Symmetry: D3
Subunit: 240 residues, 6 copies
């Protein structure tokens, strides 16, 4: 039985997303967030398995949805959310690697801006350097929420790469030299889309892996890190 | 209950993929392919909802798995398939748009090479132009299979973009001027990875939308197009 | 009479700069800041007329120095300050233009990150996009200081151009589309140098000119704007 | 005595070229091809010594002409052939080097697409990656002709460089990593011009030199290789 | 009968070129120069029809040889001349177009530097801007020779394009805005090669065509222009 | 007391600059030039401490003004001089480093063209290579003046970098390979601006430092070098 599609990639009806949305790469993690932290929750997207849900957190409307892997994937989903679904604030909630010697596995990283090896931002600004920059109120809400929860955080730059399986000599050394704290694949695509729509975005990630030492969080450590990060993000939404 | 992970993105054990794999963006379409065309089928990946299956087509081992949207996503999955899972041949089976006035909605397009606005291939070849090129035996198997099935095809170049929601003036005119037949988002990332591993890849797509006229296949027309394309691809695997 | 030179561009002896420095393009403005807001002040640089001073603001060590016009100029002075003079925090205090329809002449802009048409940041990060990003503690100190002073601010992205006399079609439209709030010439060169040295930087500017309407602050309006901005910056230094 | 010039570079009258043309870099080789394989042959171009001839091969109209060395040179001649002379199919017949460990001196290489260090294709596609791609019917005609003649072939990517005397570190390693089979200087300029005119092109080359081992075909070996390649190309024209 | 080849593209024996060489695109023009202006002349290259000759002009050793069309072609020939044949000075003698409103058809242009759309000079200087610059003594010898002959000249920048058949919007306007006096295809490739070898190069061209007005020199006018330019070049060689 | 400003960066009234201007980076050096070599001198600019003066040298009108450090700085000042102040000729008089083994500390270098790592010239010429080229009459006047004064000179290419504190591996080797004689920071920005206005520019510099050996001129040696260079420049102005 055919259903009307408000976008090519999302089964939700217009209005079915809250103005504030958390997004993570793995749709199964979106379901875990909804099941464990949202009330009044309903599934609003099933297309491509990219599960999305709308409910409330402490009474305030909040949605959560997967975004898939990479800049092109998050760009589709976020463009649609801001444009068709009229979302105002997206916080990406993710995992990351690090090269910074002072950032450790299990650390929580709040992203102020994200570099990239993608061409998508050059294309938006006449070939020039367009910093993918988080909204300050979002960053501050995340920082303040972690402080109130007594959870330490690292605040600074991420790097969003198109290539998970890097073969690039000298990259890690440059990222470390300039104190990039988080290596991931999506945030640099999100922030300029928020800008286009006059909207807001941020990102918070937990360090799953040290790219230099190959230290890696166990499943139990990843659950603890997730619980800390998601509580920070959820509490931050109450201020946004 | 924790399971050992052969890669960060795939629950399959080494050996659980056939040497030949069909891949499509939508994991739910991978399941439809498995359910309707594979025998001896078992689900071998569930991670991130990116369903993958292994069975046989007319007795020959064949797998099918989703790849998600965009070059970064297919690059993760294909790198792992060629490297860890020792796959020899991947055929991307997809949908596409067209700008070419002689290509029509519902047409089947067999891709010989794919352009891109991604930087991933420049990075592989010292900043130069590296054509993402299908393997000739794969292209020929697709062409010959369609001929034997009496299904007309268009053969030629695709363009793989990082940006589904294009705002780029003059792009469609240039794509049409040079007779790019298919606009999609992934094939240009697949072909160089096959090259790295000394392996093979190709792509076949059906035209869902005319980018100029906004003609668009209905659900029923998309099913008919899918049935034609998938039969071509499946028959081609018998020759590869 | 020859004097020993700790750098090719600065007559100050090692140790003659405080750990916190305000910098503005015009050295004559640096002198005005020193004369009107610093105590215990002494001139520490005269080379190239690029006046610099060290004293205290409300008892805390603080220096102020001109940086000249453009990324190459500020890069020389800031590299030397962080490297030879062991400075920990630099706040650029400047004027800017705007294209944003919601930013007005006389507004105070606090910069979170800065785009650029310079190549200097690509060169630092293997040709990729390296966002010139302000330190969050610096941004927050500026925001909080303005709040305590009851001075409204705009917070967001700047754009640092190499070309004051732009001839570039479409630039202003793109800057406005993505809500760049400030157009200036230096901040994108400062922030990556701070990163290299594990140090901190930020920027606050007042809008002197609307690039679209050609509204322009009179001398009296520029003095009032300067007084507001400099008080914000000086109070912020007490927290840094 | 002045003659009317249909183009600045070609003395042929409109209509004096067949719809199918073989082109090689060396005009003296074009004359050898005409003298040894064409009947009904006449010289149709003498300008700049760039000898061109029109006749028949096994009764079918066929021309042969030199194209000179490099992308800019072949671009002039091919643009004119497709535009003014209304040619439909050009097959470049050439020599090449190789780095691929599985490609040997004297091998025959049929080109499916060609990379390049030239900027000419970026200029055609808004700065993006435009694969210089051979027409599939041309490739297939070459492959099938070699099979019928029992001459082994290698099929795959070429690389067309602007710089015969390379000084570029890491280039050969990257070409080998991605299984580029032929290194030459022209094909990447030909294929996009064919596309512009809605026409067809391909390339077949013989390996004269191994770039790694410095193995090099003797004059006698080059004649044998030429005889094999040219027979393949000539027989392929009967199918095009 | 096989002859030893000192380079892959030139039949001349080492020592068979004078230290000073004139080069033009058309080998048939090289022969005209030799036949009409050199004494003691012998043909020293026949390979690829790229005629080259060595003799004397007013008793001083001088060679003349064709270079073909485009940067890749002249780069082969000039690299070999400077490296294997130990040439010290090359003057390119050519024809050109113009867009400059103050440059007229039949004018003689002496080139001080040449821009380009080729990538070959970026590759030599770490991706940066490397001006293809004529040697000052060569430029001055050409200027002084024309003065002594009472032949007016234009002195300034050329632009060497890879694409004779330009489709590029805005190019002519930019070339005119910045007073590029000559449009041709080779000089920007010559000057950096001279630099590599610690040698000298220059270029003098006659305007055959006005790109804006389509004014075009007749055959008789081209002969008169050639006679003026070649006399200037030949007299300049006596000073070099 | 407010004064009318003919430009945002210069207090001079229209007409207060001579048609010929010498410019150096350090405004204090501009004052030394005025005080020691100009008659009828008056200070015409004080803005930003960027001292400028107008008087006569041997009776002919001549101005001298500082330009600050880097391409963006000189671009502001030179654009204004050519556009608002109607200047016809600017000679940059500066200091430089060298890597060339045949160029020595204290040598005088006359610049024919300047490379750069800036993007400002690509932006002027559709992204292509635009050589920043000195006017030939200016170069020749400098060469002839030095000859008449019996002061040896080196003539050739400069390189204008945005980054005084280079971290770039391989740069010095490439500059030496291609015989760049002078390393500085401004000339590549000046020459294209002169071109835009149909005006003239050149540059002469003295070598203060050998970048390889770290040989460095003492204060006394810098004064002697300055005296030689400035006399050459001043005498050249009499011919321009």
């Amino acid at each position: 039985h055919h259903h009307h599609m408000a976008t090519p990639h999302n089964s939700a009806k217009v209005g079915d997303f809250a103005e504030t949305v958390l997004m993570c790469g793995d749709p199964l993690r979106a379901k875990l967030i909804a099941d464990n932290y949202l009330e009044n929750a309903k599934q609003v997207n099933s297309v491509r398995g990219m599960l999305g849900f709308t409910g409330t957190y402490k009474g305030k409307p909040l949605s959560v949805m997967g975004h898939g892997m990479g800049i092109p994937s998050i760009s589709i989903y976020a463009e649609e959310l801001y444009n068709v679904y009229k979302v105002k604030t997206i916080i990406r909630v993710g995992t990351c690697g690090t090269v910074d010697p002072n950032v450790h596995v299990r650390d929580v990283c709040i992203v102020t801006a994200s570099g990239t090896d993608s061409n998508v931002n050059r294309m938006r600004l006449l070939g020039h350097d367009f910093p993918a920059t988080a909204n300050f109120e979002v960053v501050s809400a995340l920082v303040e929420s972690a402080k109130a929860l007594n959870i330490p955080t690292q605040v600074g730059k991420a790097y969003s790469t198109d290539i998970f399986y890097s073969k690039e000599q000298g990259l890690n050394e440059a990222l470390a030299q300039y104190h990039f704290i988080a290596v991931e694949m999506e945030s640099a695509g999100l922030f300029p889309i928020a800008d286009y729509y006059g909207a807001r975005a941020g990102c918070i990630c937990t360090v799953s892996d040290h790219i230099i030492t190959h230290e890696s969080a166990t499943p139990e450590e990843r659950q603890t890190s997730f619980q800390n990060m998601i509580k920070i993000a959820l509490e931050a939404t109450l201020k946004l």
